[PDB]
Design a protein around this ligand. Structure first.
Ligand SMILES: [Mg+2]
Ligand SMILES: [Mg+2]
Ligand SMILES: [Mg+2]
Ligand SMILES: [Mg+2]
Ligand SMILES: [Mg+2]
Ligand SMILES: [Mg+2]
Ligand SMILES: [Mg+2]
Ligand SMILES: [Mg+2]
Ligand SMILES: [Mg+2]
Ligand SMILES: [Mg+2]
Ligand SMILES: [Mg+2]
Ligand SMILES: [Mg+2]
Ligand SMILES: [Mg+2]
Ligand SMILES: [Mg+2]
Ligand SMILES: [Mg+2]
Ligand SMILES: [Mg+2]
Ligand SMILES: [Mg+2]
Ligand SMILES: [Mg+2]
Ligand SMILES: [Mg+2]
Ligand SMILES: [Mg+2]
Ligand SMILES: [Mg+2]
Ligand SMILES: [Mg+2]
Ligand SMILES: [Mg+2]
Ligand SMILES: [Mg+2]
Ligand SMILES: [Mg+2]
Ligand SMILES: [Mg+2]
Ligand SMILES: [Mg+2]
Lengths: 394, 329, 122, 97, 176, 46
RNA sequence: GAGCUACCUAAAAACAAUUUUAUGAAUCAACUCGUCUAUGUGGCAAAAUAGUGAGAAGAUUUUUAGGUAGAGGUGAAAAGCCU
RNA sequence: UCUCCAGGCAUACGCGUAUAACAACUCGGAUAACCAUUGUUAGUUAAUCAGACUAUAGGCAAUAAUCACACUAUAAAUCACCUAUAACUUCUCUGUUAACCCAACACCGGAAUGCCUAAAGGAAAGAUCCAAAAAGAUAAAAGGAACUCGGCAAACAAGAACC
């Protein structure tokens, strides 16, 4: 079997010890007294050195087996960079959930009412796109690490202007770069999630439940799909030094205990560093599911049971052009077994706000084929964005 | 080659120098000249302070020196977004405004002349060039201009300072690079006017450090220099977007406001632009001049104990609300 | 065509070449590229109070100068240590073990001002 | 102090104190025109701007607000009767406000 | 204040300034350590004023008044320095017996010469310091030829010097 | 083409090719220094 | 002794307008090279100047640092080049 | 003030006081004026421009670029994020001038990148005269390769065919 690492690049073996050391009963004469090396005297052997006090700049870590938090059983941790090979199918298995395509009917209807329409909605949306892609910068072509965050903040500001119609929108706030974690078990596997959110919208009141108890119970017929020979833990980080923690994102006593929506961004300029659509959706489920579970465990303790009051959380993710929407309902905390009542998730995938943008006009033979600005704008996508924001008030 | 002007700078008496570079007169005070549940706003603002300091959970900064500065940035961003949100019903214009975070403002102008002192070009006459490159923490841009604070051609007896030495003696250095005039967005954007700016002072210039360096008298001067440079740049860029330059001077005054905070103390300033004719050629017979009004720094609160903010002052909160409630006529 | 004889300083060479002119360091550089000054590393001038002092830069021409006698280790020992030992020896209360009583120091460790190796400047 | 060794400092060490000072300075008339507050000095090449602040405040009881320094290259162009270059020494200039 | 960097305003423009003699070593020895510490700064401020005046005279292209004042002050400061050194030197001998404050050793360099090496301060012991280990304190056998060449070269210089002295004496005896 | 300009000065190259650390790196270079010391050269290396 | 030149390694950079297409294509600047003629010949220059010419998105040109040394190195072989 | 000409300003590399004022009139500039020369005194100021800038141990990566969307193609193509340990408020040091470098010279030569093309930067004639020969430019009656080794060079031509 080929061994990696050619010998010439490896550190060289220590010099052989002087033969005078072999002879028993003889004291070698070395250059230790001189305090410097000479080629014609024996090489001293020194005992290991101890400073006698701690210098912070030269601290040295103890080995893994000596760590106080070392545990023989392994914990698999899912974090931002993890990219699941099987995509959604693997994500559903880990979270014991059933998938429904399309958004819930209640949320969709919120925007069909023309009363919820914003004034000059289509024109204002077009301006935000142009500002994000061209106008905000002094450069000729801005980069994704700037406009991808910018488009989302501007859209939130547009929707947030609806407080004039609905005074009840003053009961929610938003934070930046909050963190979330949860520990749970699936079929003898210890699993943990460590993550962060770009922005988190929190409300003072819980969201309405989506599915009735009858629908929740009917899920028992559904069976979670498997993907042999690939294990469920492929692409997760195996850790032997870990601590069990749960985190919603705020400490106890926060006036707005109900998280409303979670936002996730793909702002990397280079394509290989950006999650693909399916892998982005898988990340959204686990991160959102962790937020819901941590909130549950907080209220009902560490016991496992089917929840009397299901918890609902929303999630939105984008790279600045394509948008994906998510709604999750947490029905049970008894995840050890693979059979029983299952959680439910609604997904709307690959929603294009615009197809392309030109920062300079396209000229062929002194004819302007394409003017600057968005191409093939689709207003439908924003309405789905607006509907999720309004949910829970209107 | 052009001098580079820093709004936030540690040099002594920078404000007096910036007046000469700009032809601005500074008046201490405020410009000559509906209940909204002030208690509710007090609750909302206190929520913002406590959320970032005591409730949010986020990864600690590595540096250990960015921690204090990073905290102060978080609260100021939260305060601006809420106050702008809460006050939208009373002032409808705030609903259609555009809110910017750490975007760039640029201005380039000519003022003065000098003789080249050495080399093969010795004796030739050259203009003195300046540029301001700035990045305000927050700013609001609207699509309609605000009303004036005093009529154009307003005259007061106070005299602009005159400096004997060259700008170099105030530590100030030159470079050659692109000249830019920028309001925060390109000319194609509809929102071409300014409403208010929010600034956060670097930790290097805060009150405690200055006292140790023995320049206690410079605590207030730092605030003034930041306002004069930042607001002169923003108004000048706005005017040139309307087509006015040194040889076609402004016909209507341009106005804007700013609040400058070091994290706890706050001060308030207003600026009016009357002249873009600052060059030697265009300034030979010009009686106009630019005006700036400012106030001394006042604390907004003192400390956070348990989960309660202690020392909240309503008087300062009124000034922030008054600035945000100004509207076009 | 280069000059071999003039001194090599930081004004010469490309940008990436730098060196000091002999000033002592006053702090440390961390990672993250931040300088951190240390207060104890900055020298402190100990200046006495000069009020009511009778001595001035110059001396009168009528002041008699004295024969030069540089101080030696023998002279210091006789003036300071010899008298005490002589009295105790007459009384008989003297032993070699208690030389520290007369001011002898076995080792310089622990002292703020060590005489060898010197740990303080002028 | 110049031409002397400083004790090496490690975490938790004493303060460094120099009882007798080896630095000598001279006040010079500005060649150019300077602001009214500013003063010029010639200082030894080993002195730092921090040292000048403490030197003036403690020895001379003068309050100082800022300090800036530069190194001036001395000419090495003049030659002696055997055609050997003469070097004018490099020196340091300090501006005190 | 800054006024101490100049002479008494009355003296400005005068051709001469009266001054006394510089401090001798023996007179200083009578004084105590505390007195000497204060006397140092009294001399120091006089030194700065004299250096200031010297430079200003060059700028105005005029002779410096009473330039001998500077030499006296510099001599005085030197005597103060040694007197303090004498006291420290004696005390070190009594307590430690060492003749030098700084540690050192006699070593051979790579060129075959014998030089005194002054030690430096380090936070770690020598056998763990990789920058120090690259320094060599020995000479290899190709240096032996150059050691002989140096010895012979020094021998020629001495012979010529003694020969010249003998010839010069011949001239003196003839003349006188 | 016109010759006479083969010296294209560069301080980094000059110190690496003919400098003090370079001369001491080999025994042949150390003997270069010894010869110039015996002659009495004022400049041992670049 | 490879700061010139020959070849290689690493990190960087430049290429307008027009016609074709989809390219060691075309016209022609920048830039690189050097066909032909005259002037010059201790010359402005120990190989240049003035015109006129070849290539100019490629086996292209250019910058910085490193490598190979004389019984040798390098070479789209001219017994070329290596201050 | 007028007449005419049309690569300038910055950075990198290199150079090392040639920088500025006054004074000199010896030497230097291939001559004067004036200095680039001689002597004396002065100068370049940064937590942002530029350089240097030592916490430790583990775990882990299928998906280019080109307005990156569509779109294919072939030569297959720039630390992050997590897990634990430790520390728990800071500004000193160095570069900064110039008409400048490599070519024996104040050499019609060579010299990387960014912006811009006159708003920046400059002067072909020391005075006079109007010969020969020599060099460069422009115009020419009638004829149009008869010139020459050869349409070399020049031309109101700058096109075609074949070995
Ligand atoms: Mg040569
Ligand atoms: Mg090479
Ligand atoms: Mg080359
Ligand atoms: Mg092209
Ligand atoms: Mg060729
Ligand atoms: Mg061809
Ligand atoms: Mg061609
Ligand atoms: Mg081609
Ligand atoms: Mg052949
Ligand atoms: Mg042949
Ligand atoms: Mg040769
Ligand atoms: Mg000059
Ligand atoms: Mg003159
Ligand atoms: Mg000169
Ligand atoms: Mg500096
Ligand atoms: Mg920097
Ligand atoms: Mg390093
Ligand atoms: Mg310069
Ligand atoms: Mg030549
Ligand atoms: Mg010549
Ligand atoms: Mg010009
Ligand atoms: Mg003529
Ligand atoms: Mg003709
Ligand atoms: Mg004819
Ligand atoms: Mg014929
Ligand atoms: Mg014939
Ligand atoms: Mg021809």
């Amino acid at each position: 079997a080929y061994e990696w690492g050619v010998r010439s690049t490896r550190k060289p073996e220590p010099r052989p010890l002087d033969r005078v050391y072999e002879i028993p009963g003889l004291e070698p004469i070395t250059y230790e007294g001189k305090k410097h090396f000479v080629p014609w005297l024996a090489r001293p052997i020194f005992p290991p050195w101890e400073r006698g006090w701690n210098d912070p700049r030269f601290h040295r870590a103890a080995p893994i087996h000596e760590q106080t938090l070392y545990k023989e059983e392994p914990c698999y941790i899912f974090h931002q960079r993890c990219r699941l090979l099987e995509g959604m199918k693997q994500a559903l298995w880990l979270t014991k959930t059933k998938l429904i395509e399309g958004l819930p009917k209640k949320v969709l209807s919120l925007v069909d009412d023309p009363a919820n329409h914003i004034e000059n909605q289509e024109q204002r949306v077009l301006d935000i796109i142009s500002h994000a892609r061209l106008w905000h910068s002094t450069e000729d072509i801005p980069k994704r690490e700037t406009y991808c965050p910018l488009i989302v903040d501007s859209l939130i500001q547009l929707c947030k202007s609806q407080i004039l119609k609905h005074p009840s929108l003053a009961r929610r706030t938003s934070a930046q770069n909050c963190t979330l974690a949860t520990t749970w078990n699936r079929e003898s596997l210890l699993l943990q999630v460590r993550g962060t959110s770009s922005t988190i919208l929190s409300a003072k009141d819980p969201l309405p439940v989506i599915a009735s108890r009858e629908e929740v119970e009917a899920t028992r017929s559904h069976v979670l799909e498997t993907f042999y020979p690939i294990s469920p833990t492929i692409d997760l980080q195996e850790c032997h030094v870990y601590e069990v923690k749960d985190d919603t994102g705020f400490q106890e006593g926060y006036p707005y205990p109900h998280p409303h929506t979670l936002y996730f961004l793909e702002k990397a300029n280079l394509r290989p560093q950006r999650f693909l659509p399916e892998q982005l959706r898988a990340k959204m489920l686990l991160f959102a599911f962790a937020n819901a579970l941590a909130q549950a465990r907080l209220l009902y303790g560490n016991t496992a049971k089917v929840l009397e009051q299901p918890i609902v959380v929303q999630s939105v993710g984008t790279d600045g052009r394509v948008f994906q929407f998510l709604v999750l309902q947490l029905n049970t905390t008894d995840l050890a077994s693979s059979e029983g009542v299952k959680n439910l998730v609604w997904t709307d995938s690959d929603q294009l706000l615009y197809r392309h943008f030109w920062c300079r006009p396209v000229i062929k033979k002194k004819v302007v084929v394409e003017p600057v600005g968005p191409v093939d704008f689709q207003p439908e996508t924003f309405r789905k964005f607006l509907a999720l924001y309004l949910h829970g008030v209107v | 080659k052009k001098y580079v002007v820093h709004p936030q700078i540690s040099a002594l008496n920078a404000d007096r120098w910036y007046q000469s570079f700009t032809k601005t007169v500074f008046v201490s005070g405020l410009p000559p000249a509906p209940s909204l549940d002030l208690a509710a706003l007090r609750a909302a603002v206190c929520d913002c302070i406590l959320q970032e300091q005591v409730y949010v959970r986020r990864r600690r900064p590595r540096s250990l020196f960015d921690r204090r500065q990073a905290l102060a940035s978080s609260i100021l961003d939260q305060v601006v977004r809420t106050l702008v949100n809460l006050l939208a019903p009373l002032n409808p214009v705030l609903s259609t405004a555009a809110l910017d975070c750490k975007r760039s403002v640029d201005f380039y102008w000519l003022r003065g002349e000098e003789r080249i002192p050495a080399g093969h070009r010795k004796g030739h006459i050259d203009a003195l060039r300046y540029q301001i490159n700035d990045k305000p923490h927050n700013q609001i841009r609207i699509s309609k201009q605000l009303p004036e604070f005093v009529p154009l051609d307003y005259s007061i007896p106070t005299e602009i300072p005159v400096m004997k030495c060259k700008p170099d003696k105030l530590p100030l250095f030159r470079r050659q690079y692109e000249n830019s005039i920028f309001t925060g967005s390109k000319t194609a954007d509809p929102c071409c006017y300014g409403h208010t700016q929010f600034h956060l002072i670097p930790d290097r210039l805060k009150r405690e450090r200055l006292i140790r360096q023995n320049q206690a008298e410079q605590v207030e001067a730092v605030f003034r220099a930041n306002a004069i440079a930042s607001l002169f740049a923003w108004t000048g860029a706005q005017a040139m977007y309307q087509g006015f330059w040194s040889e076609a001077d402004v016909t209507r005054p341009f106005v804007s406001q700013a609040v400058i905070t070091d994290g706890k103390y706050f001060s308030f300033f207003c600026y009016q632009l009357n002249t873009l004719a600052l060059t030697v050629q265009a300034d030979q017979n010009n009686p106009r001049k630019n005006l700036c009004w400012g106030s001394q720094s006042q604390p907004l609160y003192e400390t956070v104990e348990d989960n309660d903010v202690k020392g909240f002052d309503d008087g300062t909160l009124l000034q922030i609300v008054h600035f945000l409630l100004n509207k076009p006529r | 065509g280069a000059d071999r004889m003039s001194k090599w300083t930081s004004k010469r060479g490309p940008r990436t070449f730098t060196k000091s002119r002999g000033a002592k360091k006053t702090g440390i550089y961390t990672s993250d590229r931040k300088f951190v000054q240390i207060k104890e590393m900055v020298p402190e001038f100990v200046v006495p109070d000069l009020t009511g002092f009778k001595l001035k830069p110059y001396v009168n021409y009528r002041a008699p100068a004295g024969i030069d006698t540089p101080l030696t280790a023998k002279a210091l020992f006789q003036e300071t240590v010899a008298p005490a030992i002589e009295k105790d020896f007459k009384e008989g209360t003297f032993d070699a073990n208690n030389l520290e009583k007369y001011g002898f120091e076995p080792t310089q460790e622990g002292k703020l001002f060590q005489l060898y190796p010197k740990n303080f400047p002028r | 102090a110049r031409n002397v060794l400083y004790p090496l400092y490690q975490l938790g060490g004493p303060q460094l104190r120099v009882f007798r000072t080896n630095f000598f300075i001279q006040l010079v008339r500005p060649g150019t025109a300077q602001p009214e507050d500013t003063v010029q000095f010639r200082i030894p090449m080993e002195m730092t701007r921090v040292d000048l602040r403490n030197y003036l405040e403690q020895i001379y009881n003068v309050p100082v607000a800022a300090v800036r320094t530069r190194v001036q290259h001395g000419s090495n162009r003049r030659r002696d009767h055997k055609n050997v270059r003469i070097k004018k020494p490099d020196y340091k200039v300090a501006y005190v406000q | 204040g800054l006024e101490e960097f100049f002479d008494d305003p009355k003296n400005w423009g005068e051709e001469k300034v009266k001054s006394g003699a510089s401090w001798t070593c023996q007179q200083l020895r009578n004084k105590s350590n505390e007195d000497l510490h204060k006397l140092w700064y009294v001399l120091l401020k006089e030194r700065n004023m004299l250096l200031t005046l010297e430079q200003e005279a060059k700028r105005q292209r005029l002779p410096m008044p009473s330039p001998e004042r500077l030499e006296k002050v510099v001599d005085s400061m030197d005597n103060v320095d040694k007197v303090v050194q004498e006291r420290e030197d004696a005390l070190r001998l009594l307590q430690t017996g060492q003749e030098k404050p700084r540690p050192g050793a006699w070593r051979r360099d790579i060129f075959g010469r014998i030089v005194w090496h002054k030690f430096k301060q380090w936070p770690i012991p020598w056998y763990l310091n990789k920058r120090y280990n690259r320094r060599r304190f020995f000479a290899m056998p190709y240096v032996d030829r150059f050691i002989r060449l140096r010895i012979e070269k020094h021998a020629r210089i001495e012979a010529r010097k003694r020969s010249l002295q003998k010839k010069k004496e011949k001239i003196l005896h003839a003349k006188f | 083409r016109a010759r006479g300009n083969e010296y294209q000065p560069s301080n980094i190259k000059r110190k690496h090719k003919h400098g003090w650390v370079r001369r001491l790196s080999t025994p042949a270079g150390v003997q270069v220094i010894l010869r110039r010391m015996l002659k009495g050269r004022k400049s041992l290396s670049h």
